[PDB]
Write a protein that binds this ligand. Sequence first.
Ligand SMILES: [Mg+2]
Ligand SMILES: [Mg+2]
Ligand SMILES: [Mg+2]
Ligand SMILES: [Mg+2]
Ligand SMILES: [Mg+2]
Ligand SMILES: [Mg+2]
Ligand SMILES: [Mg+2]
Ligand SMILES: [Mg+2]
Ligand SMILES: [Mg+2]
Ligand SMILES: [Mg+2]
Ligand SMILES: [Mg+2]
Ligand SMILES: [Mg+2]
Ligand SMILES: [Mg+2]
Ligand SMILES: [Mg+2]
Ligand SMILES: [Mg+2]
Ligand SMILES: [Mg+2]
Ligand SMILES: [Mg+2]
Ligand SMILES: [Mg+2]
Ligand SMILES: [Mg+2]
Ligand SMILES: [Mg+2]
Ligand SMILES: [Mg+2]
Ligand SMILES: [Mg+2]
Ligand SMILES: [Mg+2]
Ligand SMILES: [Mg+2]
Ligand SMILES: [Mg+2]
Ligand SMILES: [Mg+2]
Ligand SMILES: [Mg+2]
Ligand SMILES: [Mg+2]
Ligand SMILES: [Mg+2]
Ligand SMILES: [Mg+2]
Ligand SMILES: [Mg+2]
Ligand SMILES: [Mg+2]
Ligand SMILES: [Mg+2]
Ligand SMILES: [Mg+2]
Ligand SMILES: [Mg+2]
Ligand SMILES: [Mg+2]
Ligand SMILES: [Mg+2]
Ligand SMILES: [Mg+2]
Ligand SMILES: [Mg+2]
Ligand SMILES: [Mg+2]
Ligand SMILES: [Mg+2]
Ligand SMILES: [Mg+2]
Ligand SMILES: [Mg+2]
Ligand SMILES: [Mg+2]
Ligand SMILES: [Zn+2]
Lengths: 122, 86, 105, 52, 134, 135, 50
Amino acid sequence: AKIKARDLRGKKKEELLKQLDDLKVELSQLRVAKVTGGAASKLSKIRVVRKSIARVLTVINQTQKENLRKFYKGKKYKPLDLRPKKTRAMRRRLNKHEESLKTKKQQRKERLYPLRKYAVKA
Amino acid sequence: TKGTSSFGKRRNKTHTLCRRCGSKAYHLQKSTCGKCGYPAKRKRKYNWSAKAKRRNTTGTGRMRHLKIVYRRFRHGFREGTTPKPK
Amino acid sequence: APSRNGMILKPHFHKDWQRRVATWFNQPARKIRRRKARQARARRIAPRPAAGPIRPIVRCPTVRYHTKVRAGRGFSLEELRVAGIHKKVARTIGISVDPRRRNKS
Amino acid sequence: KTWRRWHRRVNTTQKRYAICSALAASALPALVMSKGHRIEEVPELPLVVEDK
Amino acid sequence: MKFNPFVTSDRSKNRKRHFNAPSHIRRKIMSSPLSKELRQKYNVRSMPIRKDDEVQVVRGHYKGQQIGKVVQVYRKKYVIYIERVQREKANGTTVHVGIHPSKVVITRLKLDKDRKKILERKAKSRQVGKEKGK
Amino acid sequence: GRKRPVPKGATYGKPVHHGVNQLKFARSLQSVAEERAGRHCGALRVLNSYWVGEDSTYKFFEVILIDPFHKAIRRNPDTQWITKPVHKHREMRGLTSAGRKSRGLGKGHKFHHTIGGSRRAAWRRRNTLQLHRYR
Amino acid sequence: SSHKTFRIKRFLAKKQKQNRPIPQWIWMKTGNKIRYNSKRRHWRRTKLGL
RNA sequence: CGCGACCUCAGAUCAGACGUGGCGACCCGCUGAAUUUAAGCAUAUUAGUCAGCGGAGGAAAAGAAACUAACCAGGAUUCCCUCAGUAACGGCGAGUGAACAGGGAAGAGCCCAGCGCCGAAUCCCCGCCCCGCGGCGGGGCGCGGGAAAUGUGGCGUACGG
RNA sequence: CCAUCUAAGGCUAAAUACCGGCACGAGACCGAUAGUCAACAAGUACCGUAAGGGAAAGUUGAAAAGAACUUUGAAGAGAG
RNA sequence: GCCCGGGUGGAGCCGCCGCAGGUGCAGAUCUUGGUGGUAGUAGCAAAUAUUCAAACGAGAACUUUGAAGGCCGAAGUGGAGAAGGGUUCCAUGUGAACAGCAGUUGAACAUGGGUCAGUCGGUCCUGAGAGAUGGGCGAGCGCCGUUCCGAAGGGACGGG
RNA sequence: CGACUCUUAGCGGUGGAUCACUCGGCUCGUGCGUCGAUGAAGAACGCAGCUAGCUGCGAGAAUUAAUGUGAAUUGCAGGUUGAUCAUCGACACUUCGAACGCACUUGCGGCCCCGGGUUCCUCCCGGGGCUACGCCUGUCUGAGCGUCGCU
Ligand SMILES: [Mg+2]
Ligand SMILES: [Mg+2]
Ligand SMILES: [Mg+2]
Ligand SMILES: [Mg+2]
Ligand SMILES: [Mg+2]
Ligand SMILES: [Mg+2]
Ligand SMILES: [Mg+2]
Ligand SMILES: [Mg+2]
Ligand SMILES: [Mg+2]
Ligand SMILES: [Mg+2]
Ligand SMILES: [Mg+2]
Ligand SMILES: [Mg+2]
Ligand SMILES: [Mg+2]
Ligand SMILES: [Mg+2]
Ligand SMILES: [Mg+2]
Ligand SMILES: [Mg+2]
Ligand SMILES: [Mg+2]
Ligand SMILES: [Mg+2]
Ligand SMILES: [Mg+2]
Ligand SMILES: [Mg+2]
Ligand SMILES: [Mg+2]
Ligand SMILES: [Mg+2]
Ligand SMILES: [Mg+2]
Ligand SMILES: [Mg+2]
Ligand SMILES: [Mg+2]
Ligand SMILES: [Mg+2]
Ligand SMILES: [Mg+2]
Ligand SMILES: [Mg+2]
Ligand SMILES: [Mg+2]
Ligand SMILES: [Mg+2]
Ligand SMILES: [Mg+2]
Ligand SMILES: [Mg+2]
Ligand SMILES: [Mg+2]
Ligand SMILES: [Mg+2]
Ligand SMILES: [Mg+2]
Ligand SMILES: [Mg+2]
Ligand SMILES: [Mg+2]
Ligand SMILES: [Mg+2]
Ligand SMILES: [Mg+2]
Ligand SMILES: [Mg+2]
Ligand SMILES: [Mg+2]
Ligand SMILES: [Mg+2]
Ligand SMILES: [Mg+2]
Ligand SMILES: [Mg+2]
Ligand SMILES: [Zn+2]
C-alpha cells in the first residue's frame, strides 16, 4: 500500500519507469474522480500518489547522477553539474598545491635558518 | 476647465508594468523604468531615500538561495558526502 | 554674548561632530580580548619568553630626555658582528635585529 | 544619547577610606543590629572561625 | 544559580521558546512523574507521556483515585485527554476536558522497545551519577 | 585640463566656486589611462604603465596587464600575489604606481595630511570625539 | 478593453482568483485571529492600479 | 609570377578559462554644494561635509625611510594617552589647527629590474602508463606542439654582492 | 662646511574600524497615542501617471464549558 | 495632598534611608481620539407624468404581468464599436450592511457558470522617430552619433 | 400640581481612559564575518481533500531522499519494516531578471541529434543539445606595392 524508497534502489530503470507510468495514470484517474465527485477516501489518496511519484522520480535521478559521476570520476574535464559546487569565490581560489609550493630561494633560506626552540633563565 | 472638465480626457496611460522590478513604472515612450531603470544594466538606487532603499533591499524577497547558503556555511560548505546509514 | 566677566572660549563644535563620536563602551571587552590573545600566544610558544626577543639599550634622542635610557627597536649589525652573532641566526635564536641603526659612540 | 556620562571615578584614597569605615563599623553590635541583622545569639560579632 | 553564558534566563525569550517549540520538544516538555512503585522499580523519576498510558489525576476539579487511560495527546494545546475526565455540553454531547501532564502521574507504562530503551538509559545515567557522587 | 561640467556657466553659489575652465584634475593622465585599460579588460589585472609618446592633443601610454588565471603565473610562487582577490582593480582603487602619486602618500614632514591610511583616515582620526567611559 | 495582452490577462486572472472570502473552517481553528478577509476589492471602489 | 619565412592585423557556435550584477555598517579612489556662523556680506566657515560616480575584503588602506632630529642621538606601518586647543593659518575678524619627542597595544621582515656567471640550465599544453583524485596534483615515457634570446630559470638587491 | 637618506619598481600578518548579514548574551530603557512606521495577514491596506507617500489595529474565560430546550416575532431582536 | 468607611474589581503593591530621571498642564488657530448645542434644522426642487387591476409576499407609491395616458423622435433616452474598466456579463438564492425614502429589486452580498477562428485582429512592413555595434568623447555610471575616422557578404546558378 | 430647565445621587447607555499583563521594540556587548553566468539580489505566476491572507515550496510545487528522534498532525474528514518533528551532506529547483539566438508581442529564427509521417525522400509534428558581449592562452583558416630569401 505504501511505496518506499528503500526497496526501489536495486531495481533498474525500465520497471522504475513502468511503475512511474502506473502511478501517473492512477493520479489522473484520482483527479477526474475528484472532479466528478468521489469519496473522501479517494480524495485523500491524491497526496499519497503525488508523493509516491516524487519518490520514484527522486530515486531515478539519484541513481542516474551517481552512475554519471562514477563514470566521469576518471576524466580530466567534468560537466558543471558534477563539478564541486561551493561559493563562487572559493571556487576560484588557489588550490592546495599552488598555495603550498614555495620558491627555492625561500626553501634555501628556511633550510639554512630554521626557527629554534629555546628558553632563557630568569 | 483646467480641473474637473479636464480630468475626463485622460484615457491613455504613460507607464506599464516593468519586466524586471514588477512595478507599474515602465515609461512606454521613453521605454525606461522609473523605479529600477530596467534598460540600464545597474539597478537604480539613490541613498537620498533610505526608505526606498529599504523597501526593496536584500532581506525583502524569498532569498531562495542566500537562505540556503547561510545554513550551508555553518558546516564549512560540506559537500560530496552523506551521514552514515543505519 | 559675553557675560559680565569670563574667559573667551573657542569650542570646536561647529562641524557635524555628533555623527563622528567614539564611545568607549567596549573598553573592558577589548582588554579581555587582548588578554586572552596574549595568553594564547604565550601558550603557543611553549618555552620561549612571553614578551618576545630581547632588545637593546638606547638613549632618547632629545635634550628633554637624553638622560634616560629606553628599550630600542633591535640590535644593529656592528654590535652583532663584534659580538660574533650572525644577522640571520640572531632573529631565529631570539635577538631583535635592525639594520637602520648606526653607532656613533 | 548613548554618550551620557554613565560612569564615575572616585579617588583611590577615598575608596580605601570607605572600605576602612565599613570594616570598622561592622564590628559594633549596635550598628549591625540597626542594619537589621539578627545577631542576638552570636557569641562575638567579629566572628572568626578557623581555616578548616 | 545559572552560570552558563550561552543559556538565557530572559523571561520573554524563555516564554517564546516554550510557546513555539517544535513537536519533538513538546514531547520532552509534556512529561509527567511516575508513581512510587514504578519509580522504585525502574529507578526513574519522570517519563514523557504516551498515547495509552493510564493516569491518576492529582490536582484540579477531577483529582481522585480513578485510573484513567489516556485517549490522545494534543501537543498543540499542551494537553492530554483521559477517557474518564470529561463534561457534557449544552446539547448533551460529552467532550473531554484538557489536563496538563505536569498535574498527572502514570500508573503503569506502555512497554514498547523504545520505551524500555529510554527507561534503561535514564536509569543507567542516574546510577552512574549517583556512583560518581559517592 | 578639466573644465567643470556645468550647463553654460551657472555654477550656482558663492563666487569662490565660480571657476569653470581653469581647474585641474586630481589624478594624472597616466592614472586615467590605466583605469580605462582596466575597465575595458575586466578579466585582467593592471600591473604598471609607461609613457611612449605625446603630441599637442594626445598622450600615449602602454600598460601591462596580467591574466590572473593563467597557470604560468598561478604556479609561480613570487607572482601569485596578484591572483588574490584583494588585488582587484588596483588602478580603480589607486594602488598602482601612477595612481599612488596622486594620493599624497609619503613619510616625513611633507606628508602629514595622510598619517594613517590616507586623507580620509587622517581626517576621521582628527575629527572625532574620544568620549571615554570615565572622562 | 477586449484587446488585451497575455500578461495583462494573467494578472487579471490572479487578481480575480484572490477575491474570494475565507473558508468557514478557518475562524474556529485554535491559534486564529482572523475574522474575515480584509483584502477584498470591489471594481467600483478601488481601480486595481494598472 | 610562384614558393617559404618573419612582422603587423583579421575571422570564427574553434579547445579550455576569466569579467559583468547585488549588498554596501566598516574601507579605498574621484567629484563635491548650499542651508548655517560671521548679529549685514563677497574672502573665510559650514566642508573636502551632504548628495553623485567607481572598486573591494573579512577587514580595507598603510608599511619596512630619497624618515625624525641636531641630541651622549633615535629607527617599517597601524592604534590609544599626551604633546595641545599648542607651533601655525585667519576681512589676523568670526573661526580653523597639526607634527616631533615621551609612555603604551602589537611587533616580521622581504623580493625584482639592472650589473654579471651558468650549453634556456625556464615555462605552458596535448597522447600513453602508474597513485589517490568532492580545493585536477605527483612520477615515467613520447625524433609530440608551442612560448621564449625583442631574454625564462638558479646565484644575487644597498643590511653590500 | 656639516648631518641624514637613496626617489621616480613590487609583496607583507598583529595591534585598528564595523548603525549591513548569521548566531547569541544582557539592560537602573519603553510598556500599545510609549518603544522601530510596523507586538496584529506592515512597508500591509490605501493615495499618486510616476519619483514616492503610508496607516489604524493587543487582552472572553482556568478550561468553549461559546448559552441545549420552550415561547413571541418574517427577522434582527427578546423573555424563560 | 493624604488617611479611613462603603461599592466594583480580580493579582500584584506600598512605608522609611539613599540613588536616578523622558517626573506634575488650562491654554500653544497645541497632537491624537471621543462627544455636544446647532438640530430632528438646512435640505432629499435642472431636463412635462403618471393612473387602474391582479400575483407573489409578514410587509408594495417604487417589484412582475395586463390595460391606459405620456416622453425620447433616427444629429435618439435606439442598435453596435475604439480607449478605459476587469467579471461589472448569465442563472439561482438572501435581504445583515450599501443603492442619502423604500424595496419582494440591483452594476449590492452569496453560490455556481460563461469568451472556441488558416479566412476577424495582433503577429509582418515602414512613417515621424527610437536605438546597438565600428568610431569619438568621457574621472565615471555612461554619453554622442545611425553611415558617419569600419577587412560590415557566412549567400548562390553553375563547374571541378 | 403638569410640561420645560437646573443641581446632586442611584441605575442604564455612549466612549474607551486608567491599572495590570507583553512570543514586540530600543540600546550595549560577544563570536563569526559567507552572494553571482555551476545563473545572485529582486520580481511574476503557480502548488494544499476542503485554502482567501500570512508562511512554506517549484510541475518531484505547505515538499522527495538521507540522518537523528520515537507515536503523532489536528479545524473536519481519510489512512514500530517507523507517524510526526528536527537536522540537512543526496537529488530537484517554472518565467523574467547581469539574463545570454534575435526582440519583448511571448512574436520570429538557424544548426546538430532522436521519436511520430516517412519506412530518409524530402516536408510537417513532438523531444533533446547548442546559437550574447568583452577578454586571455593555444589551434585552424586567412590578408598586406610591410621586411625579406630561392626561382
Ligand atoms: Mg550601483
Ligand atoms: Mg544676560
Ligand atoms: Mg559668569
Ligand atoms: Mg550545564
Ligand atoms: Mg579634489
Ligand atoms: Mg611628482
Ligand atoms: Mg470610477
Ligand atoms: Mg542673524
Ligand atoms: Mg542674508
Ligand atoms: Mg565661502
Ligand atoms: Mg574647504
Ligand atoms: Mg556620500
Ligand atoms: Mg561590482
Ligand atoms: Mg565577500
Ligand atoms: Mg592590504
Ligand atoms: Mg630599503
Ligand atoms: Mg614614527
Ligand atoms: Mg595644557
Ligand atoms: Mg579686523
Ligand atoms: Mg578645514
Ligand atoms: Mg611619537
Ligand atoms: Mg610591549
Ligand atoms: Mg636575469
Ligand atoms: Mg629604491
Ligand atoms: Mg618602496
Ligand atoms: Mg601594498
Ligand atoms: Mg553580564
Ligand atoms: Mg491602554
Ligand atoms: Mg480592551
Ligand atoms: Mg488574570
Ligand atoms: Mg524612564
Ligand atoms: Mg488638556
Ligand atoms: Mg424641514
Ligand atoms: Mg447606444
Ligand atoms: Mg447593447
Ligand atoms: Mg445583471
Ligand atoms: Mg435607503
Ligand atoms: Mg470553419
Ligand atoms: Mg544612443
Ligand atoms: Mg444621571
Ligand atoms: Mg493557493
Ligand atoms: Mg522524508
Ligand atoms: Mg524518519
Ligand atoms: Mg510589436
Ligand atoms: Zn523596473
